Each structure stands twice: as C-alpha cells, then as structure tokens.
C-alpha cells in the first residue's frame, strides 16, 4: 500500500499554485510545441518546489558555516534529469533553467548534457560500439563522475566535453567551461546509473553521490517510440540542405522508409537501452515526473 | 588539491565546542574503554553536527508540508554507520544514540545492526558460505533494502531480524519491531554498498537511497587487526564458562594459538572483505571519521 513517494495527480499538482513577455518568448524559444498552460500548471510549481529544496540547503550552509567556522566555499546545487531517449529530458532541463533563473538567490544556472561525455567515434569504432551510443560502455563515465566531483569540491572552473548532432560525434575542441554556478542542471540518460552498470570499468562513487536532487522523466514505451520517431523525422527534415550533416544520410530515404529505419533503431538500440539500463534506475530519483499523450504531465511522485 | 570533503584535524574538531551523571553512567555502560575526554572532544560535536542536519530536515518538512498541502506522514531520519569489522561501528552508534536522545525534538532513537540480515547458517552452509560471513553473498540484501524502504514509506512498524554472537547465527524467532522512530541509526559493514557489490543477485535501489546521513569509521589496517585480535580474545574469555557458546570452541586453545587463529581469520576473511568490499565504499559517506592508536579520532572529513 505505502511507497517511498508522495503521489500527485495532475490536478493536485496544478492546485499547488504568471510570467513576463520576455519569459514567454524564451519559453517558446525552447520548444514551439511547449504548451504555456503546461508551463503554468506543471513547471512553475516544480520550479517552486526545487527553490524550496535549494533555499533549505542555502540556509543549512549558513548554519553550518557558523558552527564549523569555515570560510564557506561556494558549492553549486546540482539537479540531475534522467529518462529515456526522447522522453523530454532536454526540454525539461531548459524550462527549469529558465524558471529557476527568476529568483535573485540563484541566478547563475548552468545546464550540461551528459551526451558530451560519450567516447568519440574513433574510440567507439575501435571498441565496436558505434551502434551502442547511449549504452554504459559508450560513456567516458569516470570523466563524468570527475566533473561533478570537481564541482562538489569547489573548483573555480570545470570543463565539459560537448556533443554535436550535426557531426554525430564529440566536438574535437568544443569543451565548455563551467565556473561555479549557483545551480547546475545535469541532464542525460545515465545520471542515476552507478558502478553496477559499468562492470567492464567499475567506478565506486556515483554521479548521484554528487547530485542534490534528481528527476526521472517517465512515459510509457509506446509514447516514447512515437516521440522518438517524430524527432527522427524532424532531424531528417532539418538536414535536407546540409550535405555534411549526419542526418543528411536519411534524406535519401523516402519518409516511409525513414519511419521504418527509425522504428528499427528504436526497437534494437533505444528500447533495449531503456529496459536494460535506464528504466531500472527510475526509483533512485528524488522525483518521478510521468507524461502522457501530447507530453501532458499526468503524475508527479516526490520522495517522502 | 581540492576534494569533496571539508577536513578537520582533532584540535579543529574539538574546538567546535558537559554531561549529567546518569549520562556518564550510560556512556560507561556502553564501553569501559571509552574515554570520556574523547566523548567530550569528538562525539559531542558530532552529535551537535548531526542535530543541525536533522533540524534542517525537520524545518524543510514543515515548509514543504505547507506548500504541498499534505497531512504530513512522520518519516524517520536515518543515519548509517559503515566501516571494517572491529573499527568501532557499534560503539560509535551506541554513543550517538545516547547523545542524540538529549534533544527534545528527536528523543526516540532506534539502533539496528545489519548483522541480523545475514542468511541463517542453514542457508549459508547450503551455499558454501560459512567462511564468508560479512561478504555480500552472505547477506539477505533485498530484505535490508526493503527494511529501510519501508521506514522511508512511513509504515507504522517494520521488523528486523537479529543476530546472536552466542550462537553465531540469526536468532530463530528474535525479530525486533521498529515503530516509526524519530531517528534510526543503521550500523553495519555494508550500508554504503550497492548493486555492484551484489552481481549474483542485483538490487537497483540502494540502502544509501534511503539513508539521510552516512558515517564511515576509518582506521589503518594494522590498528584494525590489533582491535580485531583484542576483541576475539575478549569473546574467548567471555565464553570460558558457557559450553553452548560459539566462542567456547576457542577456549580449548592456548591464548597463543588463539592469537594465531584470530590473525589467520583476519588475514583470510576480514582483511579480504575490507579491501574488496568495504573500503571501496568509503568516499560514498557524508562523513569520514578516522581513528588512530587507542581509538583516538585524529581526522574528520565532512562533505561540502
Ligand atoms: N513538454 C514538452 N512539450 C512538447 N514537446 C516536447 C516536450 N518535451 C519534449 N518534447 C519533444 O519531444 C521530443 C523529445 O524531447 P527531448 O527534450 O529532445 O528529449 P530527450 O532530451 O529526453 O531525448 C522532441 O521532439 C521535443 O520537441
Ligand atoms: N571509541 C572507542 N574507545 C575504546 N574502544 C573502542 C572504541 N570503539 C570501539 N572500541 C573497541 O574496539 C573493538 C571494536 O569495536 P566494535 O564497536 O565492536 O566494532 P564494529 O562494530 O565496527 O565491529 C571492541 O573491542 C570495542 O570495545
Ligand atoms: C542522446 C545520445 C547520448 C547522443 O546525443 C545518444 O544516446 C543517442 O541519441 N542515442 C540514440 C541512438 C540512436 O537512436 N541513433 C541513431 C541516430 C539518431 C540519433 C538521435 C535521434 C535519432 C536517431 O532519432 C531521434 O533522435
Ligand atoms: C559482524 C558480522 C556481520 C557478524 O556479526 C560478521 O561480518 C563478522 O563478525 N564477521 C567476521 C568473520 C569472522 O571473523 N569470523 C570468526 C568468528 C568471529 C566473529 C567475530 C569476531 C571474531 C571472530 O573476532 C572478533 O570479532
Ligand atoms: Mg537530449
Ligand atoms: Mg559490530
């Protein structure tokens, strides 16, 4: 009967409760399909919830700084966002970055995707892993752990590698420098994974050990597949006139064969990755946000 | 240069700063070798530190209860204590239970050892694991995870199995019932372990996912060995006149051969377990407390 999570249906979550014209523009800049009603009813209360957790942490830090007699190194609050390929992790992260910025206390909000920490294609091909991107063996997981550990050590700056969907590879010299933000949002399919998922090269302190609050964005596998295919088709269209783009390869296929191939890539790669590696980490999240048709949130679960 | 931990030498930790006659008696009741100077200089500041973390959590819970509109289920704050066999986990846990009791807000402090969650001897012998007690394969780890998960679900009571050093087995019908304490201290060598340590029977949410604050009690392996041998000899002496006691078997050996055998048990079982399974989990702790000769704390590290 009882679980470790408080449960809110959509109506209960919306009942927890407006924006500037330049905030609306920024939100529409993130995604043209993003419903402003959804932002108002779901994401605004979520940003408020997160601010309570962040504020409580800042308060505690002052209390402990007084007790411990420390100079008080500035340490970022880190929020991680996990879930299937195509569930909406990136959209959620960008909306939360925009909304969390509104508070004076924590105005510098960085967003880092774990995509960048994939091994480059040259390494993957050597290892026979070109069709296993997003699987644990495809990640430089020690480097990702070191990244969040460095932030949680108070280093003045840390560098993250960045991934390109144009070249479908790590950007050779495109490393992003992060300089002690108030908040870092760390978004990627593997942020709740741990040593057990990396038996080929074990690590013993986990990403989650350096994350303050984690969100798992959830949806049934039939919706994920349809959102995956929709995106695939959008990437194909966006590459029509860029011959040097990875997705330009799919421009040569009819839309119908493109759907067939995307469906195969879902079934053989991404659905496998979901079932074997991503979905089992769900109950490690501070909060599970569940989506239904049209990306409407229908359930929020928060750890008691 | 920089790590995820604030570092305090003994003098800095003691500088963070007295007790009742019945509190002194209780403390001396826990361990006759426990120095009251050590309690005053080390454990009192540690209990104060923990109270700040617990208090901050209680405050946050009221803020969120108002925001979320919840009835507000009482959920125990859980402190876990990890480290080598014979490092002093049990002594530390008992001292902290005594000291945390002093605050009106959190007077009901339960202490549970993970010893109880070992498979019974009948199961271990079937599996060939009688010489592997304390190793991951020797634990009913799913049951231990379910225990802390149940507490963190707000169940009115949860039952823990209890271990006996008299019979060196789980007590057949000696299960302890825990009824929603303010604080639960969960003490055992495996409390920072995770799925990776249980590849023979993986679990996907960890003990640490249901623990608020973790302590790893640390000491160099030469001190651990000497404390192990000292205890072994104390257990041997305590069993001289109990023919039905497991340690009565060692009464038949000279003290000299008893030392030899204890030394072998350390080298072959407990030191292996330390190196392979316990010590790698150290950097998962909220706090690392390091001991030197005579059990004197010489370093405290607290996560920034
Ligand atoms: N809240 C939302 N409203 C409308 N569309 C969304 C929403 N979240 C994600 N999407 C869409 O669904 C697809 C997957 O989202 P994305 O953020 O790329 O997922 P992920 O980062 O998890 O792979 C994209 O086509 C995106 O436009
Ligand atoms: N703070 C301390 N002061 C003095 N002796 C201690 C202290 N902590 C532990 N000991 C002693 O060291 C041995 C190991 O302690 P114990 O609490 O049984 O360790 P664990 O529970 O980690 O196996 C015991 O003989 C105990 O009396
Ligand atoms: C998100 C990651 C980390 C790379 O940015 C990676 O896990 C990833 O996108 N994996 C999906 C593997 C896959 O489907 N590859 C075929 C090419 C492709 C990439 C992204 C797509 C896609 C197809 O359809 C919609 O999104
Ligand atoms: C603490 C545990 C979980 C059982 O209570 C178990 O890990 C444990 O005590 N393992 C040690 C294995 C071991 O040394 N066994 C030989 C008998 C023995 C038990 C406890 C001892 C001991 C010897 O010397 C001092 O403490
Ligand atoms: Mg993405
Ligand atoms: Mg013990």
CA-based max dimension of chain A: 67
Rounded distance, CA B262 to CA A269, Å?
A: 53
> Residue ranges per domain, chain B?
1-304
How close is the nearest chain B Cα to the Cα of A235, in Å? 34
Whether B97 and B90 have beta carbons less than 8 Å apart is answered as no
DSSP summary character for residue B112: E
Rounded distance, CA A238 to CA A257, Å?
A: 17
* Residue A123 labeled ligand binder: no
Place of tokens 């560098």: A159
Element of type H or E holding B260: helix B255-265
Select from B178, B47, B179, B174 the least CA-distant residue to B100: B47
Whether A191 and A217 have beta carbons less than 8 Å apart is answered as no
Q: Does B238 touch chain A (CB under 8 A)?
A: no
Annotated binding site of B: 83-90
Whether B215 and B82 have beta carbons less than 8 Å apart is answered as yes
User: DSSP 3-state assignment of B81?
Assistant: strand
Beta bridge partners of B300: B8, B289
Orientation angle between helical segments A44-68 and A89-100, nearest 10 degrees: 60
Select from B50, B52, B42, B54 the least CA-distant residue to B16: B42
* Tokens matching residue B257: 């051969």
What residues contact residue B138 under an 8 Å CB cut-off, 6+ apart? B118, B119, B124, B129, B132
Rounded distance, CA B299 to CA A267, Å?
A: 53
Write the CA distances from A95 to A34, A186, B53, B221, B240, integer angstroms.
10, 13, 31, 50, 70
Write the CA distances from A42 to A11, A45, A221, A291, A297, integer angstroms.
10, 6, 22, 11, 7
CA angle in degrees (0–180, nearest 5) for B109-B115-B287? 55
Q: What are phi and psi of A32, to 5 degrees?
A: -70, -20
DSSP summary character for residue B86: T
- For this PDB entry, the determination method is X-ray
* Tokens matching residue A8: 């809110």
With CA atoms as reference, the chain B residue closest to A65 would be B304
Select from A48, A165, A156, A79 the least CA-distant residue to A118: A165
Q: Work out the number of other CB atoms within 10 angstroms of the CB of residue B25.
A: 10
Q: Can you point out the beta strands (E) in B182-228? A: 183-187, 213-218
User: DSSP 3-state assignment of B4?
Assistant: coil
CB-facing half-sphere around the CA of A172: CA atoms within 13 A: 2
DSSP summary character for residue B107: -
* Tokens matching residue B44: 């009192």
Q: Can you point out the beta strands (E) in chain B? A: 5-9, 77-82, 109-113, 158-160, 163-164, 169-170, 176-178, 183-187, 213-218, 287-291, 297-303
What residues contact residue A218 under an 8 Å CB cut-off, 6+ apart? A83, A87, A282, A288, A289, A290, A291
Whether B160 and B178 have beta carbons less than 8 Å apart is answered as yes
Whether A24 and A53 have beta carbons less than 8 Å apart is answered as no
With CA atoms as reference, the chain B residue closest to A5 would be B153
Whether A114 and A93 have beta carbons less than 8 Å apart is answered as no
Q: What are phi and psi of A253, to 5 degrees?
A: -85, 150
Q: Report whether residue B33 contacts ligand 2, using a CB cutoff of 6 Å.
A: yes
Whether A117 and A143 have beta carbons less than 8 Å apart is answered as yes
Whether B6 and A68 have beta carbons less than 8 Å apart is answered as yes
Burial (CB count within 10 angstroms: exposed 0-12, middle 13-18, buried 19+), residue A225: buried
CA dihedral over B24, B25, B30, B34, signed as positive or negative? positive
End-to-end Cα spacing for chain A:
14
Q: Report whether residue B88 contacts ligand 2, using a CB cutoff of 6 Å.
A: yes
Place of tokens 């009192």: B44
User: DSSP 3-state assignment of A262?
Assistant: helix
Written as one string, the DSSP assignment of B40-85 is IIIIHHHHHHHHHHHHHHHHHHHHHHHHHT-------EEEEEE--T
User: DSSP 3-state assignment of A290?
Assistant: strand
Select from B7, B89, B4 the least CA-distant residue to B301: B7
Rounded distance, CA A26 to CA B141, Å?
A: 48
Atom of ligand 4 nearest to the CA of B115: 3
CA dihedral over A30, A31, A32, A34, signed as positive or negative? negative
Q: What are phi and psi of A201, to 5 degrees?
A: -160, 70
Write the CA distances from B23 to B27, B98, B296, integer angstroms.
6, 8, 21
Beta bridge partners of B288: B216, B301
Whether A2 and A298 have beta carbons less than 8 Å apart is answered as no
Q: Which of left, alpha, beta for A70 (phi over 0: left; psi -120 to 50: alpha)?
A: beta
What residues contact residue B49 under an 8 Å CB cut-off, 6+ apart? A64, A67, B16, B287, B302
**Distance (Å) from CA B1 to ligand 6 centroid:** 35
List, in sequence order, the alpha helices (H) in A128-252: 141-151, 221-238, 248-251
- CA dihedral (B54, A2, A7, A283) in degrees, to 10, reads 80
The CATH architecture assigned to A1-304 reads 3-Layer(aba) Sandwich (3.40)
Rounded distance, CA A284 to CA A263, Å?
A: 29
List, in sequence order, the alpha helices (H) in chain A: 10-14, 21-30, 36-38, 44-68, 89-100, 121-127, 141-151, 221-238, 248-251, 255-265, 271-273
Select from B163, B250, B153 the least CA-distant residue to A303: B153
Place of tokens 């009835």: B71
Q: Work out the number of other CB atoms within 10 angstroms of the CB of residue B86.
A: 21
Whether A237 and A99 have beta carbons less than 8 Å apart is answered as no
Rounded distance, CA A238 to CA B67, Å?
A: 43
Q: What are phi and psi of A192, to 5 degrees?
A: -100, 5
Beta bridge partners of B213: B79
Select from A97, A48, A40 the least CA-distant residue to B64: A48
Rounded distance, CA B43 to CA B51, Å?
A: 12
**Distance (Å) from CA B271 to ligand 2 centroid:** 17
With CA atoms as reference, the chain A residue closest to B15 would be A68
Q: Report whether residue B116 contacts ligand 4, using a CB cutoff of 6 Å.
A: no
List, in sequence order, the alpha helices (H) in A71-220: 89-100, 121-127, 141-151
DSSP summary character for residue B139: B
Rounded distance, CA B34 to CA A192, Å?
A: 41
């Amino acid at each position: 009967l009882m679980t470790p999570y408080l449960q809110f249906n959509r109506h209960q979550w919306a009942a927890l409760r407006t924006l500037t014209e330049d905030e609306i523009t920024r939100l529409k800049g993130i995604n043209e399909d993003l419903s402003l009603e959804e932002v108002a009813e779901i994401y605004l209360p979520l940003s408020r919830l997160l601010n309570f957790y962040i504020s409580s942490n800042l308060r505690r830090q002052a209390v402990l700084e007084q007790f411990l007699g420390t100079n008080g190194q500035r340490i970022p609050y880190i929020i991680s966002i996990a879930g299937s390929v195509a569930v909406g992790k990136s959209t959620t992260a960008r909306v939360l970055q925009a909304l969390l910025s509104r508070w004076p206390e924590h105005r510098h909000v960085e967003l880092i995707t774990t995509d960048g920490f994939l091994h480059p294609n040259s390494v993957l091909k050597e290892r026979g892993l070109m069709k296993k991107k997003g699987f644990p063996q495809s990640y430089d997981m020690h480097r990702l752990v070191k990244f969040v550990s460095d932030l949680k050590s108070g280093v003045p700056q840390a560098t993250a590698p960045v991934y390109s969907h144009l070249i479908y590879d790590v950007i050779p010299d495109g490393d992003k420098t992060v300089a002690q933000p108030d908040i870092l949002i760390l978004e990627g399919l593997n942020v709740l994974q741990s040593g057990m998922d990396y038996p080929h090269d074990p690590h013993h302190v986990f990403v989650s050990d350096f994350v303050d609050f984690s969100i798992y964005v959830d949806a049934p596998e039939e919706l994920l597949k349809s959102w995956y295919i929709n995106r695939f088709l959008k990437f194909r269209e966006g590459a029509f006139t860029d011959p040097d783009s990875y997705f330009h390869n799919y421009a040569k296929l009819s839309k119908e064969e493109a759907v067939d191939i995307a469906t195969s890539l879902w079934n053989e790669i991404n659905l496998m990755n979901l079932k074997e590696n991503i979905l089992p980490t769900r109950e490690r999240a501070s909060l599970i946000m569940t989506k239904s048709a049209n990306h409407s949130v229908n359930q929020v679960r928060l750890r008691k």
